[PDB]
Design a protein around this ligand. Sequence first.
Ligand SMILES: [Zn+2]
Ligand SMILES: [Zn+2]
Ligand SMILES: [Zn+2]
Ligand SMILES: [Zn+2]
Length: 171
Amino acid sequence: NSVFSGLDMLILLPYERRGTRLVVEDYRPDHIYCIGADFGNQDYSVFSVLDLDTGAIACLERMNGATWSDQVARLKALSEDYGHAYVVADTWGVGDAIAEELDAQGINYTPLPVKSSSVKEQLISNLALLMEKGQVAVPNDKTILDELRNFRYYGHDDIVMSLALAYSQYE
Ligand SMILES: [Zn+2]
Ligand SMILES: [Zn+2]
Ligand SMILES: [Zn+2]
Ligand SMILES: [Zn+2]
């Protein structure tokens, strides 16, 4: 891939399906986690749980055709399940609507509105560099790998963006 020149170094994790969740590891209370969150109607929302101690994705949740409140409900549940993992949320949409609903549901988040190509490239370039270094590990799932393999800046990229938002927190 032109953007992800380090695709061969991506670590491919075994996982168990649990509905909309791909689960690599259950919550370890001795580890700290964050979540990268992208929001979609028939477009997908994707929430990626990163173990900040290992640098590996512990869980990835993906859904479409779910109502706005159900999406936010799933995000709240996933955060809570991994120790109220803080959420790096793409809050860019109509007004402050996304942030309002996250604040109203008590979700622990940091806003990172992907409002321009500069912000998108900042996130994707970081993911790509970590991947080159062998530091990105994701569930070995066809849908995830296809989005990464077929990624172009200008054909869904919601998984890519969610992963990039999570890995923005990893040194
Ligand atoms: Zn290859
Ligand atoms: Zn809670
Ligand atoms: Zn999409
Ligand atoms: Zn998206």
